[PDB]
Amino acid sequence: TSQVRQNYHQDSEAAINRQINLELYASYVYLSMSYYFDRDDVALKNFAKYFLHQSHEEREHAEKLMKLQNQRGGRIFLQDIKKPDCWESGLNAMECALHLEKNVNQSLLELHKLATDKNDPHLCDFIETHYLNEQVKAIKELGDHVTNLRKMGAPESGLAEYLFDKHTLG
Amino acid sequence: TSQVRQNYHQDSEAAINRQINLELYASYVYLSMSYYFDRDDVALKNFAKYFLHQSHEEREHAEKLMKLQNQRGGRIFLQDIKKPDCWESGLNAMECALHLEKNVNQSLLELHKLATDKNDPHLCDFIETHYLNEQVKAIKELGDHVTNLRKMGAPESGLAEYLFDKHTLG
Amino acid sequence: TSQVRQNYHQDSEAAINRQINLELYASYVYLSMSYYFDRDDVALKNFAKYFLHQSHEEREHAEKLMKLQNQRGGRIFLQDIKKPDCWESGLNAMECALHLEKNVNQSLLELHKLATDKNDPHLCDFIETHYLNEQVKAIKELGDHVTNLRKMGAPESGLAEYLFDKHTLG
Amino acid sequence: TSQVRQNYHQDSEAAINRQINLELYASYVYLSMSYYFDRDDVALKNFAKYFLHQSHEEREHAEKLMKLQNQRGGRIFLQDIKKPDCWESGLNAMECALHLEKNVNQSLLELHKLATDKNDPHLCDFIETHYLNEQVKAIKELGDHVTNLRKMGAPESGLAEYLFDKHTLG
Ligand SMILES: [Cl-]
Ligand SMILES: [Cl-]
Ligand SMILES: [Cl-]
Ligand SMILES: [Cl-]
Ligand SMILES: [Cl-]
Ligand SMILES: [Cl-]
Ligand SMILES: [Fe+3]
Ligand SMILES: [Fe+3]
Ligand SMILES: [Fe+3]
Ligand SMILES: [Fe+3]
Ligand SMILES: [Fe+3]
Ligand SMILES: [Fe+3]
Ligand SMILES: [Fe+3]
Ligand SMILES: [Fe+3]
Ligand SMILES: [Fe+3]
Ligand SMILES: [Fe+3]
Ligand SMILES: [Fe+3]
Ligand SMILES: [Fe+3]
Ligand SMILES: [Fe+3]
Ligand SMILES: [Fe+3]
Ligand SMILES: [Fe+3]
Ligand SMILES: [Fe+3]
Ligand SMILES: [Mg+2]
Ligand SMILES: [Mg+2]
Ligand SMILES: [Mg+2]
Ligand SMILES: [Mg+2]
Ligand SMILES: [Mg+2]
Ligand SMILES: [Mg+2]
Ligand SMILES: [Mg+2]
Ligand SMILES: [Mg+2]
Ligand SMILES: [Mg+2]
């Protein structure tokens, strides 16, 4: 048993390992989306920059969960990072990102339920302090972006996506 | 009844008084450990500095609980600060510190369970915000220190403890 | 056909996609190695920092190949990032890193042979300018590290790994 | 024979003279395009500035080849700079520029093949270091510009070209 382990259920340790994989998966999805906008036949540099920043943020989220695992005396178990499942347009990518962030949020809420069921207040506070509000903010931002693109006439209006790239993501 | 008291159970007030005593006790243990390393026949100045800093931190932890008691309308009840129970070597002191920090953590987790049972979210947040992660970080650090000292050959190798004092605690 | 594509063989495009996966795999291996040294029962913070830096560098190597694919009019095709195959000690991790960097180098040399066979001087120069010397430098550094750890008495001497962490990786 | 000439085939010298003429021709094409956008009946100042910058860059490319000829002991032989062959719109000019840059790239790749066939590694490195990636970058940029203008509704939308002038070329 780890000399540091205290009040850390094996189920919580396993759930943290699963969450690490999901954060890495999200980083990979955003990496894919970024380079789609870097294609010569899409060419929206600010969409590309936005999604690359989001990819790097997800890698940081994964590293912080890996640090947590070690802080609590758990053992990191890594699995394959699946390739992104399925970008068409700026609007479609924003919609896919909104769906991804809501999926990650659901996983974090399930993790919090488990921590609450196992009476682990440190883990509850960790999730609340570093992940829950970040998710709410990401989801709101992506919703705002989807709304604007739709109102502007995307995805049929290439002018809409061009101007959004310059004015909102620039 | 205090004019400020609201949602503060008498059991929580008593448990906060007990936690104040434990924090003061921990300060005293670290004070004892510090001056052991200041002895001419031990002479590890960075072990001494490290434990003195830890003593002062525990006094701050106690003062913040005393402030909380007053903030919530409870009344501070102080008890004797027992002398430290039982330092031999740098490794042994680090091991004793790890055991102490795990004991304090267990007390804080019991305090949190009580606050949760009495539906006191302010007290839950106080413990989570100012105490739980500090404990996890302290325990991880001490575990790291114990591991290094053991791998280096302590406590039989006086060279190990000398070099750890200079490179890790310096 | 991409409007920008010129002198870019389909085989070169496919080989670039394979190299992107390998760079991402190498990033994942180094990420795993980093957090192993962050464990409370290993506790070598500079080994952890060194391998994390190496992980981030490999992600940059992958992103530059993704940019190249788009620059030349190729299409990025991503595959799963396999979990690291198999850390025991600082020496063992350094030895595994040396083997990984030599494997990546071999892949880059095969990529260069293909570019040379397809008369693609831009791709040859890209590989030579951004990848070949970086690989030679990484391999030399890791060889130097392995040599020092072995001469110091690793992996049996925990003192050797402790001092290398402080003096070479610090 | 030049006192400095070494490993410099007469065919390579002649091919360098041809490349000097092409670079000067490209400078002239971009000069023509620039002043078209300066017309009162076109009036896109940033298209004009963009193409003038490109003209000056091509003159620098020619001067560097003239310096190379002298460095290697060859003799510069100049020919007439033909007037630009054939601007209608911002999109059409960008499309013509993309075609020109791909033509120049093809000439550079043929020059590299000759240098490789004559075992002239200095000339190969010169072309790779100062010309090949510059061409790939120019072609990608122009492709990106063409894509954006088309998606925005050019050349029928004068608003598209106006906004591209301000947001992308400004
Ligand atoms: Cl436990
Ligand atoms: Cl504006
Ligand atoms: Cl009350
Ligand atoms: Cl091609
Ligand atoms: Cl030393
Ligand atoms: Cl010669
Ligand atoms: Fe995000
Ligand atoms: Fe995340
Ligand atoms: Fe999607
Ligand atoms: Fe909290
Ligand atoms: Fe402390
Ligand atoms: Fe304390
Ligand atoms: Fe003790
Ligand atoms: Fe809270
Ligand atoms: Fe590296
Ligand atoms: Fe690499
Ligand atoms: Fe290995
Ligand atoms: Fe080269
Ligand atoms: Fe140019
Ligand atoms: Fe040129
Ligand atoms: Fe033309
Ligand atoms: Fe070269
Ligand atoms: Mg699959
Ligand atoms: Mg917060
Ligand atoms: Mg007594
Ligand atoms: Mg906190
Ligand atoms: Mg497998
Ligand atoms: Mg070559
Ligand atoms: Mg170089
Ligand atoms: Mg004529
Ligand atoms: Mg270069």
Curated annotation (Swiss-Prot), chains A, B, C, D:
Name of the protein in its database record: Ferritin heavy chain
Physiological role: Stores iron in a soluble, non-toxic, readily available form. Important for iron homeostasis. Has ferroxidase activity. Iron is taken up in the ferrous form and deposited as ferric hydroxides after oxidation. Also plays a role in delivery of iron to cells. Mediates iron uptake in capsule cells of the developing kidney. Delivery to lysosomes is mediated by the cargo receptor NCOA4 for autophagic degradation and release of iron.
PANTHER family for this protein: FERRITIN, FERRITIN HEAVY CHAIN
Chief subcellular location: cytoplasm
Keywords linked to the UniProt accession: Acetylation, Cytoplasm, Cytoplasmic vesicle, Iron, Iron storage, Lysosome, Metal-binding, Neurodegeneration, Oxidoreductase, Phosphoprotein
Entry-linked Pfam families: Ferritin (PF00210)
Tissue: Expressed in the liver.
Outcome of swapping K82Q: Reduces iron binding and oxidation rate. No effect on iron binding but the oxidation rate is severely reduced
Record site feature (Essential for association with cargo receptor NCOA4), residues: R18
Disease: Hemochromatosis 5: A disorder of iron metabolism characterized by iron overload. Excess iron is deposited in a variety of organs leading to their failure, and resulting in serious illnesses including cirrhosis, hepatomas, diabetes, cardiomyopathy, arthritis, and hypogonadotropic hypogonadism. Severe effects of the disease usually do not appear until after decades of progressive iron loading. Neurodegeneration with brain iron accumulation 9: An autosomal dominant neurodegenerative disorder associated with iron accumulation, primarily in the basal ganglia. It is characterized by global developmental delay apparent from infancy, and progressive decline of motor and cognitive skills. Clinical features include delayed walking or inability to walk, spasticity with hyperreflexia, ataxia, dystonia, and poor or absent language.
Residues bound to Fe cation 2: E58, E101, Q135
Enzyme superclass (EC): oxidoreductase
EC number: 1.16.3.1
Subcellular localization: Cytoplasm; Lysosome; Cytoplasmic vesicle, Autophagosome
